[PDB]
Amino acid sequence: APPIMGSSVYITVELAIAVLAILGNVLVCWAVWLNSNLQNVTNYFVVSLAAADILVGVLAIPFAITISTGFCAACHGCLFIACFVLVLAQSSIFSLLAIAIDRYIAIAIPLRYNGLVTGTRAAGIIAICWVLSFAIGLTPMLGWNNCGQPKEGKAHSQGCGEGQVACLFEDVVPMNYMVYFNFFACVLVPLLLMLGVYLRIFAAARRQLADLEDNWETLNDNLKVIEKADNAAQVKDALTKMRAAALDAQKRHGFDILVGQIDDALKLANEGKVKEAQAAAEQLKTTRNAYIQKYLERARSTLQKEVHAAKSAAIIAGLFALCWLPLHIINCFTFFCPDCSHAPLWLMYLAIVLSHTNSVVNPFIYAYRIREFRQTFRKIIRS
Numbered sequence: 001a002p003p004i005m006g007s008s009v010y011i012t013v014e015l016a017i018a019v020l021a022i023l024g025n026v027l028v029c030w031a032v033w034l035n036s037n038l039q040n041v042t043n044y045f046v047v048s049l050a051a052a053d054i055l056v057g058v059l060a061i062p063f064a065i066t067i068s069t070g071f072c073a074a075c076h077g078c079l080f081i082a083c084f085v086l087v088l089a090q091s092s093i094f095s096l097l098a099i100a101i102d103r104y105i106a107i108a109i110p111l112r113y114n115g116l117v118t119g120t121r122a123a124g125i126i127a128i129c130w131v132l133s134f135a136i137g138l139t140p141m142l143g144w145n146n147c148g149q150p151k152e153g154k155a156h157s158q159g160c161g162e163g164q165v166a167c168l169f170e171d172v173v174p175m176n177y178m179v180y181f182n183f184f185a186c187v188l189v190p191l192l193l194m195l196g197v198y199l200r201i202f203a204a205a206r207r208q209l210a211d212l213e214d215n216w217e218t219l220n221d222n223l224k225v226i227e228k229a230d231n232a233a234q235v236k237d238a239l240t241k242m243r244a245a246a247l248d249a250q251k252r253h254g255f256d257i258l259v260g261q262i263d264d265a266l267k268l269a270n271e272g273k274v275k276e277a278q279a280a281a282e283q284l285k286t287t288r289n290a291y292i293q294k295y296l297e298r299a300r301s302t303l304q305k306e307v308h309a310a311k312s313a314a315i316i317a318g319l320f321a322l323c324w325l326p327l328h329i330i331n332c333f334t335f336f337c338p339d340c341s342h343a344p345l346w347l348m349y350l351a352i353v354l355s356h357t358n359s360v361v362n363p364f365i366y367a368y369r370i371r372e373f374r375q376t377f378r379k380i381i382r383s
């Protein structure tokens with residue numbers, strides 16, 4: 001069959017993906033610019049991620065359509081159009097890792113987050129990561145390429161001029177670079193790091209949620225211990241356990257009343273006044289109902305919002321892996337199994353197309369999972 005037919009389907013699908021990648025991610029950038037509730041450090045990496053996907057539609061996809069034709073070109077110019085998508089994918093990996101690390105700092109040290117993670121430091125990390133993405137993605141342009149050994153038979157059959165090659169990805173970009181350097185070192189290792197960070201985020205959140213329910217249980221159990229105590233020394237022991245727990249959960253008016261009321265009951269318990277200490281300890285229930293339960297449920301609601309936001313960011317990282325892994329796995333078969341027939345052209349186009357679809361998916365995940373984004377999208381679209 002004429003090459004231009006299956007080429008037309010591939011190119012048409014690519015152009016459709018490019019249109020969707022630009023539109024959805026311009027909408028993400030417009031939402032962050034317009035809404036100050038979306039202007040935080042986490043979303044500055046989201047915007048950098050969206051900028052990379054905009055460039056996938058504007059440059060990488062036109063480059064991919066070009067490289068698929070095998071047109072005659074100077075080898076190093078062919079190398080650039082083949083490698084620029086590697087820059088954008090690397091930038092995405094840095095942004096995804098930074099988002100995960102940012103959410104871990106928020107869940108692990110919320111007391112120092114605003115002092116450690118600032119907009120100025122975020123903007124500098126983003127600039128550094130873009131420079132490193134160019135260095136990693138364009139490493140073949142520094143000499144690790146196949147331009148020294150061109151397929152002159154393919155170039156002559158295409159009528160290419162002197163110094164030109166049939167511009168094809170696997171003819172200019174070495175497979176050992178794509179497998180060992182790009183996939184294993186620069187893609188697989190950071191994704192595995194992302195997985196570990198997310199595991200530590202969800203483990204820390206589960207630990208802090210368990211600690212809240214434990215402190216709540218310890219407060220109410222020691223309440224009953226005081227109620228059914230038989231001597232003043234037992235009430236003293238239980239109150240000492242409540243006071244240490246009250247200060248640990250405090251690390252404002254409700255806790256000042258709570259600790260003060262415990263100190264009251266502990267003073268009577270030291271004097272041997274058991275029924276006076278028990279009666280004073282009963283006043284803690286009034287403080288617990290009016291103040292302590294409100295703090296526990298607000299902290300619980302805040303921790304669950306962080307789990308929800310971390311799940312949304314993990315889905316984004318997972319979809320990046322799902323969309324990009326098939327192409328990388330095919331490269332592994334090409335490189336590691338020279339006795340295996342090369343994957344057919346239609347599967348390569350499908351794997352290339354699938355990797356490009358990742359540039360479309362993030363704006364949907366924000367709209368479906370983040371209310372502030374969804375509402376800002378609606379306002380932008382409606383107006």
Ligand SMILES: CC(C)CCC[C@@H](C)[C@H]1CC[C@H]2[C@@H]3CC=C4C[C@@H](O)CC[C@]4(C)[C@H]3CC[C@]12C
Nearest residue numbers: 059072073074075076077078079080081164167
């Ligand atoms: C500001 C942005 C949009 C600039 C985009 C510039 C792009 C489109 C330019 C910059 C470098 C260019 C390449 C440089 C060299 C060659 C080798 C030549 O034999 C064929 C064209 C080719 C392969 C060019 C294609 C177009 C190219 C990739």
Ligand SMILES: CC(C)CCC[C@@H](C)[C@H]1CC[C@H]2[C@@H]3CC=C4C[C@@H](O)CC[C@]4(C)[C@H]3CC[C@]12C
Nearest residue numbers: 073074075076077078079080081084138141163
């Ligand atoms: C917006 C500004 C900063 C653009 C900076 C990037 C420019 C300078 C880069 C991007 C791609 C580059 C080209 C990539 C490949 C080739 C083909 C090679 O045989 C000669 C150099 C040449 C032609 C490069 C010249 C410099 C180049 C055009």
Ligand SMILES: CC(C)CCC[C@@H](C)[C@H]1CC[C@H]2[C@@H]3CC=C4C[C@@H](O)CC[C@]4(C)[C@H]3CC[C@]12C
Nearest residue numbers: 321322325326327329330333340341342343344
């Ligand atoms: C992340 C998950 C969803 C990836 C799915 C795995 C994909 C990429 C795997 C599963 C089966 C694999 C194929 C199995 C057999 C062959 C025949 C061989 O001659 C070339 C490679 C080829 C054609 C493989 C290409 C990669 C492949 C299509």
Ligand SMILES: CC(C)CCC[C@@H](C)[C@H]1CC[C@H]2[C@@H]3CC=C4C[C@@H](O)CC[C@]4(C)[C@H]3CC[C@]12C
Nearest residue numbers: 188325328329330332333334335336337338340
């Ligand atoms: C944690 C997971 C997702 C890491 C990614 C798995 C990758 C590295 C694995 C999954 C399946 C593997 C392939 C399975 C089968 C073969 C055929 C053999 O003749 C050479 C190795 C080769 C081509 C393997 C290379 C490595 C491979 C592509």
Ligand SMILES: CCn1c(=O)c2c(nc(/C=C/c3ccc(O)c(O)c3)n2C)n(CC)c1=O
Nearest residue numbers: 063064067085169170178327331345348352
């Ligand atoms: C992730 C980087 N990357 C790649 O790794 C890649 C690739 N395009 C191919 C392969 C194309 C091909 C292979 C055999 C053929 O006969 C043919 O006509 C075309 N690969 C292996 N691009 C798309 C431009 C790409 O972005």
Ligand SMILES: CCCCCCCC/C=C/CCCCCCCC(=O)O
Nearest residue numbers: 124128129131132134135136137139
């Ligand atoms: C191909 C991989 C290339 C590796 C190059 C290694 C260089 C990485 C450099 C570290 C970035 C640190 C930037 C600090 C600049 C000053 C910022 C400041 O004022 O503290």
Ligand SMILES: CCCCCCCC/C=C\CCCCCCCC(=O)O
Nearest residue numbers: 057058062063065066069070071072
């Ligand atoms: C914002 C603009 C986005 C890109 C606009 C251009 C759209 C066209 C997309 C790819 C053009 C590929 C050109 C074909 C290469 C030459 C084929 C050949 O000479 O054999």
Ligand SMILES: CCCCCCCC/C=C\CCCCCCCC(=O)O
Nearest residue numbers: 120121123124125127128131132135
């Ligand atoms: C060829 C690239 C080799 C490796 C380059 C190393 C990366 C250094 C890039 C420039 C850093 C410029 C930004 C530093 C200022 C902001 C730092 C910050 O606020 O944390």
Ligand code: NA
Nearest residue numbers: 053092358359
């Ligand atoms: Na991306």
